Design a protein around this ligand. Structure first.
Ligand SMILES: *[C@@H]1O[C@H](CO)[C@@H](O[C@@H]2O[C@H](CO)[C@@H](O)[C@H](O)[C@H]2NC(C)=O)[C@H](O)[C@H]1NC(C)=O
Ligand SMILES: *[C@@H]1O[C@H](CO)[C@@H](O[C@@H]2O[C@H](CO)[C@@H](O)[C@H](O)[C@H]2NC(C)=O)[C@H](O)[C@H]1NC(C)=O
Ligand SMILES: *[C@@H]1O[C@H](CO)[C@@H](O[C@@H]2O[C@H](CO)[C@@H](O)[C@H](O)[C@H]2NC(C)=O)[C@H](O)[C@H]1NC(C)=O
Ligand SMILES: *[C@@H]1O[C@H](CO)[C@@H](O[C@@H]2O[C@H](CO)[C@@H](O)[C@H](O)[C@H]2NC(C)=O)[C@H](O)[C@H]1NC(C)=O
Ligand SMILES: *[C@@H]1O[C@H](CO)[C@@H](O[C@@H]2O[C@H](CO)[C@@H](O)[C@H](O)[C@H]2NC(C)=O)[C@H](O)[C@H]1NC(C)=O
Ligand SMILES: *[C@@H]1O[C@H](CO)[C@@H](O)[C@H](O)[C@H]1NC(C)=O
Ligand SMILES: *[C@@H]1O[C@H](CO)[C@@H](O)[C@H](O)[C@H]1NC(C)=O
Ligand SMILES: *[C@@H]1O[C@H](CO)[C@@H](O)[C@H](O)[C@H]1NC(C)=O
Ligand SMILES: *[C@@H]1O[C@H](CO)[C@@H](O)[C@H](O)[C@H]1NC(C)=O
Ligand SMILES: *[C@@H]1O[C@H](CO)[C@@H](O)[C@H](O)[C@H]1NC(C)=O
Lengths: 441, 135, 98, 49, 49
């Protein structure tokens, strides 16, 4: 519980500020899949297909929907990660006003183009498999029937690899980072224009209502704070059981759905057994066909339920993908004035990062630190005329009156060029007495 | 190389599949892996433009597809595609009917693993190449 | 009716957050936005006179500050009349919740 | 006794009907819990008329 | 009877899962409006009022 000492002639203004770094996790796409209706529903038998052919062409719409989902995931990934038409390259030097950037820039030393933070993120997340050329032949030896993917391939369920590889995604992220570090935000509206980092920082501070002289008189402090913050976030993201649960959830749900589907195959469904050969033997056709029909209907209904459940998640995945694309466009390529969207507190910029089946952001924010008591008044009446601040707040420590900006204490002296007059001073509420310098005289 | 206990008859695994069996005559551990199976996809550049096509197989190293083609006993054009005219092996599978080059430009028909097939004009034939992100 | 549906295995679980805690959150949010401006969204809340906040908001949408400080009583009267009107409308209307 | 032969559909449904339950309170907490502290109004109430 | 009742339960759970997504979307929109029009003024036109 906290209380605010609200008084109709009191105000508080910060002196320090503080830079901070926060992360954000967003899934972008799931794992594509395909099914083999004929061999799954009955098996290796031949009469199963003959009895099935008189049914409907159920596999057609299932294949159509699955192919639609598979292409839709590719469309989502391409839409979110292809917002630029050029592949920029970083300059050979790595000096930007004293800042540190080795933690996110690509490392040519590593054979695989993947920066340090991306390396940690990729190693932290554990997938079902790394490569995808692995098949039944790659299962030879004791590896056979020892992998979940291998058993799924045994049961006629195959996985189609995504069109875009990891290296292309890394190159896209590196190009975006280079464009947002060298050319500023202008490269999102045509041709990139080079500009020094300090002037871009001055622009961004001017965006949130702070004069550039604050930055150009404190550059070392912001540089050190930014470097310490990026080091701290690098150390902290490793941790254990971190916010990567959002990405882990998709894989867990897919694995649970596939496991339930495959294990559900061995149900008798109220028949004599769940073996096609066993039903084929020990029984004459007249009731064996009834049992086979019941089993086929049950298995087909279960497959349809699985298809519907799988189709369900595509809508939420697409919504998350559109949200991620929106965040990319309106946080990386510029500065968003909408509060609490591109981070917590006043927003400065962001640097994207790539993760398996998702994207990772690194917001950069700005927060005031230490405030002070002050006494304020709404207006000033010197020559029987009201005076108002051009922009800022009229303040005073107790003895003399000064005018200063909003989010940074910086007293000055009231002058004619810093104020504009309007009307008389007999209609405002809390006006006081003071004088104006009027430097012309 | 996996070993069995003296009383074990035949093994299993996760998702209740018959993994390994021990031969009654010799008591030696043997393994089971089914025959190659997978989907088939056909790449075409449009019937108006041309009629030749390139076929594809998913998740299969195809050093043994001529056997499957002969067993299928289809028309001789299927056996022609079983010949080693131009066989290129990819991450998704192997491609038959189109040659491989390495000059990269904008994609036309997605295949997978950053490989696209287009119809270049130089004689006209189906060409396969690697994805290009730009300049 | 609830007892009827109960005997067939259908149950309803109580929500985690009671209405009292929701009311407390709403009161806290209203206090923060009424006495500290919009600063408390970013960091520590800072006290500021309400009239100066009104001048801030009018300075936002293309209007100079001197407009507010000369018409305070009219603004107060219009706001009070508006709140009375919305209270009366909500009291009378029993179907807009939808 | 006979239901056990039909499989573990009960487990599937019980698992399904819990994601919604966690979804609801997650939604409510995300929408409302936006303040770190709990402020309260001053004893006097005079906001400039 | 078993299969019919189980299929009916499947339909009901599917419908509930349908409505849950729309409820999530509404909750997310409400949270965004809360953040952008209670914690600060929004320059977007007609978004709030
Ligand atoms: C604004 O904040 C900075 C840092 O938060 C303060 O600078 C510190 O000054 C002390 C004493 O000179 C040093 O020991 C610290 O090392 C400085 N901080 C850092 C990060 O190096 C500064 O004093 C604050 N402003 C004012 C007016 O006090
Ligand atoms: C920018 O950051 C890198 C990464 O921390 C700094 O490189 C470190 O340098 C120290 C001392 O030279 C070594 O002990 C570390 O092992 C280096 N880290 C890595 C990951 O190689 C680099 O010094 C920083 N640049 C500046 C100008 O401070
Ligand atoms: C409020 O700020 C003013 C401006 O700094 C202070 O006035 C100065 O105080 C120092 C302290 O000895 C003097 O050396 C200067 O000559 C003063 N300025 C002038 C123009 O005379 C004032 O003391 C501050 N008041 C409080 C209560 O801190
Ligand atoms: C601000 O200064 C003005 C001028 O010095 C003050 O106006 C005078 O106040 C005295 C106080 O009783 C009156 O007798 C005069 O008639 C006023 N003069 C005029 C021209 O109206 C004013 O009171 C001061 N304000 C405050 C709050 O002290
Ligand atoms: C089966 O009986 C034969 C009778 O001699 C056992 O010996 C095997 O004989 C066959 C045919 O002559 C050979 O191929 C095998 O190599 C023999 N076995 C060995 C271990 O040398 C045989 O062991 C019996 N098999 C059992 C008991 O499993
Ligand atoms: C300002 O507050 C004080 C005490 O809270 C009160 O007496 C005074 O009347 C207020 N100002 C005005 C103009 O009413
Ligand atoms: C400002 O004044 C209030 C009123 O007493 C006080 O509680 C608060 O601590 C002061 N601010 C600072 C930064 O000390
Ligand atoms: C093939 O090209 C011709 C020539 O323009 C065109 O009329 C025809 O519609 C094309 N085929 C298809 C299937 O669109
Ligand atoms: C087919 O190719 C893959 C990769 O090139 C290899 O791992 C596999 O062993 C090959 N198949 C056979 C039967 O050698
Ligand atoms: C295309 O063929 C090989 C494929 O690896 C490549 O090494 C070669 O450089 C390419 N051809 C030319 C003319 O560059």
């Amino acid at each position: 519980e906290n209380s605010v000492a609200y008084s109709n002639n009191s105000i508080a203004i910060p002196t320090n500020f503080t830079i901070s770094v926060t992360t954000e996790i967003l899934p972008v796409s799931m794992t594509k899949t395909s099914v083999d209706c004929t061999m799954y529903i009955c098996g290796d038998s031949t009469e199963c297909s003959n009895l099935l052919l008189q049914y409907g062409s159920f596999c057609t719409q299932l294949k159509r929907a699955l192919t639609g989902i598979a292409v839709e995931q590719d469309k989502n990934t391409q839409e979110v990660f292809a917002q630029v038409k050029q592949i920029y390259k970083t300059p050979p030097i790595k000096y930007f006003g004293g800042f540190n950037f080795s933690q996110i820039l690509p490392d040519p030393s590593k054979p695989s183009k993947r920066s340090f933070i991306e390396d940690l993120l990729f190693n932290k997340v554990t997938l079902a498999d790394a490569g995808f050329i692995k098949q039944y032949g790659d299962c030879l030896g004791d590896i056979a029937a020892r992998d979940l993917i291998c058993a799924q391939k045994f049961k006629g369920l195959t996985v189609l690899p995504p069109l875009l590889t990891d290296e292309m995604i890394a190159q896209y992220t590196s190009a975006l980072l280079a464009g947002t570090i060298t050319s500023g935000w202008t490269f999102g509206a045509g041709a990139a224009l080079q500009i020094p980092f300090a002037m871009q920082m001055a622009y961004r501070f001017n965006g949130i209502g702070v004069t550039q002289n604050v930055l150009y008189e404190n550059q070392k402090l912001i540089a050190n704070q930014f470097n310490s913050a990026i080091g701290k976030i690098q150390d902290s993201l490793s941790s254990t059981a971190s916010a990567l649960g959002k990405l882990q959830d998709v894989v867990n749900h897919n694995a649970q759905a596939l496991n339930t589907l495959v294990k559900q195959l061995s149900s008798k469904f109220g028949a004599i057994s769940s073996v096609l050969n066993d039903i084929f033997s020990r029984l004459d056709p007249p009731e064996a066909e009834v049992q086979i029909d019941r089993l086929i209907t049950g298995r087909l209904q279960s497959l349809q339920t699985y298809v519907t459940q799988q189709l369900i998640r595509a809508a939420e995945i697409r919504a998350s993908a559109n949200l991620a694309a929106t965040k990319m466009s309106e946080c990386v390529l510029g500065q968003s004035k909408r509060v609490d969207f591109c981070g917590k507190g006043y927003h400065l910029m962001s640097f994207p990062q790539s993760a398996p089946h998702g994207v990772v952001f690194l917001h950069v924010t700005y927060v005031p630190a230490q405030e002070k008591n002050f006494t304020t008044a709404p207006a000033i009446c010197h020559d029987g005329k009201a005076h108002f601040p051009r922009e800022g707040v009229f303040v005073s420590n107790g003895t003399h009156w000064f005018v200063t900006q909003r989010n940074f204490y910086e007293p000055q002296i009231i002058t004619t060029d810093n104020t504009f007059v309007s009307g008389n001073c007999d209609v405002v509420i809390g006006i006081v007495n003071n004088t104006v310098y009027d430097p012309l005289q | 190389n996996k070993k069995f206990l003296p009383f074990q008859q035949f093994g299993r695994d996760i998702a209740d599949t018959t993994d390994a069996v021990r031969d009654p005559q010799t008591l030696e551990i043997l393994d089971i892996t089914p025959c190659s199976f997978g989907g088939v996809s056909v790449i075409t550049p449009g019937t108006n433009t041309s009629n030749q096509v390139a076929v594809l197989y998913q998740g299969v190293n195809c050093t043994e597809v001529p056997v499957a083609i002969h067993a299928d006993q289809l028309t001789p054009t299927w056996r022609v595609y079983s010949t080693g005219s131009n066989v290129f092996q990819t991450r998704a599978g192997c491609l038959i009917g189109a040659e491989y080059v390495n000059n990269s430009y904008e994609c036309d028909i997605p295949i997978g693993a950053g490989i696209c097939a287009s119809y270049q004009t130089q004689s006209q034939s189906i060409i396969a190449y690697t994805m290009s992100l730009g300049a």
